[PDB]
Design a protein around this motif. Structure first.
Motif, PDB file in Angstrom:
ATOM      1  N   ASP A 299      59.570   9.529  58.562  1.00  0.00           N
ATOM      2  CA  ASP A 299      60.598   8.979  59.442  1.00  0.00           C
ATOM      3  C   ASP A 299      61.947   8.837  58.737  1.00  0.00           C
ATOM      4  N   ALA A 300      63.005   8.573  59.523  1.00  0.00           N
ATOM      5  CA  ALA A 300      64.364   8.703  59.010  1.00  0.00           C
ATOM      6  C   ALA A 300      65.382   7.782  59.681  1.00  0.00           C
ATOM      7  N   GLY A 301      64.965   6.833  60.518  1.00  0.00           N
ATOM      8  CA  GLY A 301      65.901   5.888  61.098  1.00  0.00           C
ATOM      9  C   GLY A 301      66.901   6.534  62.048  1.00  0.00           C
ATOM     10  N   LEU A 302      67.969   5.782  62.320  1.00  0.00           N
ATOM     11  CA  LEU A 302      69.049   6.261  63.171  1.00  0.00           C
ATOM     12  C   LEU A 302      69.864   7.335  62.455  1.00  0.00           C
ATOM     13  N   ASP A 303      70.558   8.159  63.242  1.00  0.00           N
ATOM     14  CA  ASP A 303      71.484   9.116  62.646  1.00  0.00           C
ATOM     15  C   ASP A 303      72.579   8.402  61.863  1.00  0.00           C
ATOM     16  N   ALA A 304      73.070   7.276  62.385  1.00  0.00           N
ATOM     17  CA  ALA A 304      74.086   6.512  61.674  1.00  0.00           C
ATOM     18  C   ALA A 304      73.570   5.970  60.348  1.00  0.00           C
ATOM     19  N   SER A 305      72.253   5.867  60.182  1.00  0.00           N
ATOM     20  CA  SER A 305      71.658   5.389  58.944  1.00  0.00           C
ATOM     21  C   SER A 305      71.387   6.498  57.936  1.00  0.00           C
ATOM     22  N   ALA A 306      71.531   7.766  58.322  1.00  0.00           N
ATOM     23  CA  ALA A 306      71.179   8.864  57.421  1.00  0.00           C
ATOM     24  C   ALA A 306      71.853   8.754  56.059  1.00  0.00           C
ATOM     25  N   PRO A 307      73.160   8.506  55.955  1.00  0.00           N
ATOM     26  CA  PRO A 307      73.762   8.386  54.619  1.00  0.00           C
ATOM     27  C   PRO A 307      73.166   7.260  53.796  1.00  0.00           C
ATOM     28  N   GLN A 308      72.759   6.160  54.434  1.00  0.00           N
ATOM     29  CA  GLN A 308      72.202   5.035  53.691  1.00  0.00           C
ATOM     30  C   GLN A 308      70.807   5.354  53.170  1.00  0.00           C
ATOM     31  N   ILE A 309      70.007   6.082  53.954  1.00  0.00           N
ATOM     32  CA  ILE A 309      68.680   6.455  53.479  1.00  0.00           C
ATOM     33  C   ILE A 309      68.797   7.386  52.280  1.00  0.00           C
ATOM     34  N   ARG A 310      69.734   8.337  52.324  1.00  0.00           N
ATOM     35  CA  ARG A 310      69.952   9.190  51.160  1.00  0.00           C
ATOM     36  C   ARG A 310      70.358   8.361  49.950  1.00  0.00           C
ATOM     37  N   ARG A 311      71.255   7.393  50.146  1.00  0.00           N
ATOM     38  CA  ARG A 311      71.640   6.513  49.047  1.00  0.00           C
ATOM     39  C   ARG A 311      70.441   5.735  48.519  1.00  0.00           C
ATOM     40  N   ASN A 312      69.562   5.275  49.415  1.00  0.00           N
ATOM     41  CA  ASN A 312      68.374   4.546  48.976  1.00  0.00           C
ATOM     42  C   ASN A 312      67.468   5.435  48.139  1.00  0.00           C
ATOM     43  N   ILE A 313      67.263   6.673  48.580  1.00  0.00           N
ATOM     44  CA  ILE A 313      66.458   7.615  47.812  1.00  0.00           C
ATOM     45  C   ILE A 313      67.100   7.867  46.453  1.00  0.00           C
ATOM     46  N   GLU A 314      68.419   8.070  46.441  1.00  0.00           N
ATOM     47  CA  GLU A 314      69.122   8.313  45.184  1.00  0.00           C
ATOM     48  C   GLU A 314      69.109   7.076  44.293  1.00  0.00           C
ATOM     49  N   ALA A 315      69.222   5.886  44.890  1.00  0.00           N
ATOM     50  CA  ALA A 315      69.217   4.655  44.105  1.00  0.00           C
ATOM     51  C   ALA A 315      67.907   4.471  43.351  1.00  0.00           C
ATOM     52  N   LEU A 316      66.791   4.918  43.929  1.00  0.00           N
ATOM     53  CA  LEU A 316      65.507   4.851  43.245  1.00  0.00           C
ATOM     54  C   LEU A 316      65.372   5.897  42.154  1.00  0.00           C
ATOM     55  N   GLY A 317      66.269   6.876  42.115  1.00  0.00           N
ATOM     56  CA  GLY A 317      66.254   7.895  41.096  1.00  0.00           C
ATOM     57  C   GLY A 317      65.699   9.233  41.526  1.00  0.00           C
ATOM     58  N   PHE A 318      65.486   9.448  42.819  1.00  0.00           N
ATOM     59  CA  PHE A 318      64.915  10.689  43.322  1.00  0.00           C
ATOM     60  C   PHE A 318      65.998  11.536  43.982  1.00  0.00           C
ATOM     61  N   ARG A 319      65.663  12.802  44.214  1.00  0.00           N
ATOM     62  CA  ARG A 319      66.614  13.792  44.702  1.00  0.00           C
ATOM     63  C   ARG A 319      66.214  14.261  46.094  1.00  0.00           C
ATOM     64  N   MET A 320      67.211  14.386  46.973  1.00  0.00           N
ATOM     65  CA  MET A 320      66.957  14.905  48.313  1.00  0.00           C
ATOM     66  C   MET A 320      66.306  16.280  48.255  1.00  0.00           C
ATOM     67  N   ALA A 321      66.731  17.112  47.299  1.00  0.00           N
ATOM     68  CA  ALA A 321      66.237  18.480  47.201  1.00  0.00           C
ATOM     69  C   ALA A 321      64.756  18.547  46.860  1.00  0.00           C
ATOM     70  N   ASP A 322      64.171  17.459  46.365  1.00  0.00           N
ATOM     71  CA  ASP A 322      62.757  17.447  46.019  1.00  0.00           C
ATOM     72  C   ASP A 322      61.859  17.021  47.177  1.00  0.00           C
ATOM     73  N   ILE A 323      62.425  16.665  48.328  1.00  0.00           N
ATOM     74  CA  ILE A 323      61.626  16.298  49.493  1.00  0.00           C
ATOM     75  C   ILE A 323      61.139  17.578  50.161  1.00  0.00           C
ATOM     76  N   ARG A 324      59.823  17.770  50.178  1.00  0.00           N
ATOM     77  CA  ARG A 324      59.227  18.977  50.733  1.00  0.00           C
ATOM     78  C   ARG A 324      58.914  18.856  52.217  1.00  0.00           C
TER      79      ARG A 324
END
Length: 275
Positions: free
Chosen positions: A57-82
């Motif tokens: 899941d991925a929340g609202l469209d308006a939340s998309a930048p924040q979810i990416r920031r959350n993933i990045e804040a934990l130290g992971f990369r968007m490009a590694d999501i399969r």
């Protein structure tokens, strides 16, 4: 499908409700290899693995930048999501999938009914009509009940739980450590015309089968698409303070089904008794 003009629609909740549920929270760990990257009440769960990650899941469209920031804040990369798996195809859970798909290159997994509704950007909702559209998505892999995906020792399994929508899907996760997790889709029917709904005639039989389907599953960690349903905010604070096992709850799923059943039957009983 085309909606029956003789079938009244439910009134969607106001977008303000989803906005309040979309309030950010600091990302955190539910369990080793399992990360929460959603909002206060709109769940998004990242499963990390040596061969890539799975996002549920991925929340609202308006939340998309924040979810990416959350993933990045934990130290992971968007490009590694399969893979990006969807519970149900409304803006509250699929609104940001299009943008998260574009940012990651992942393949989206969803049931056929969710795939059709995502291709319509949320429109032709059996209950809501076109009330709450969101960016359309083309599902890469259509899921069938019982289908399994394997990634770096993790198993992702589809558990169809229709009712909230015809394609509503719950997800069973088996981690490489052997712990099991269910991410339960909603069983709520807010403002729904339940009885002999021409846009969804099997609704009540489906949702009652979804109760029994989830009740026949035993897991270690109970999660849901809505934080309030599994005590997200309380468990989050406890774990940050030192309660490593805050999200371990072997009776959690059974408790969720019992509550959901009682709430549903109470609503259906009131509609059945309408003079």
């Amino acid at each position: 499908a085309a909606l029956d003009p003789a079938q009244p629609l439910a009134e969607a909740p106001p977008y303000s409700l989803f906005e309040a549920w979309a309030k950010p929270v600091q990302p955190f760990a539910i369990w080793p290899g399992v990360w929460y990257v959603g909002t206060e009440n709109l769940s998004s769960v990242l499963l990390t693995t040596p061969q890539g990650h799975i996002l549920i899941d991925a929340g609202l469209d308006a939340s998309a930048p924040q979810i990416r920031r959350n993933i990045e804040a934990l130290g992971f990369r968007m490009a590694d999501i399969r893979y990006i798996a969807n519970s149900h195809a409304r803006l509250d859970q699929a609104g940001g999938i299009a943008r998260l798909k574009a940012w990651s290159g992942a393949r989206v997994i969803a049931s056929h009914a969710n795939a059709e509704q995502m291709a319509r950007g949320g429109k032709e909702d059996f209950a809501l009509g076109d009330a709450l559209p969101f960016p359309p998505v083309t599902v890469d892999m259509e899921a069938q009940d019982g289908q399994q995906w394997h990634l770096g020792g993790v198993t992702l399994a589809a558990i169809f739980t229709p009712g909230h929508l015809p394609g509503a899907t719950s997800w069973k996760v088996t981690l490489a450590d052997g712990k099991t997790l269910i991410y339960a889709d909603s069983l709520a029917t807010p403002g729904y015309p339940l009885i002999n709904n021409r846009n969804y005639p099997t609704l009540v039989e489906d949702i009652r089968r979804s109760f029994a389907r989830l009740e026949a599953q035993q897991v270690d960690i109970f999660l849901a698409n809505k934080g309030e349903r599994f005590g997200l905010m309380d468990k989050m604070a406890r774990k940050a303070r030192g309660e490593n096992n805050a999200f371990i709850d072997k009776a959690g799923l059974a408790r969720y089904v019992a509550q959901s059943r009682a709430a549903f039957e109470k609503q259906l009983a009131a509609q059945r008794a309408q003079p």
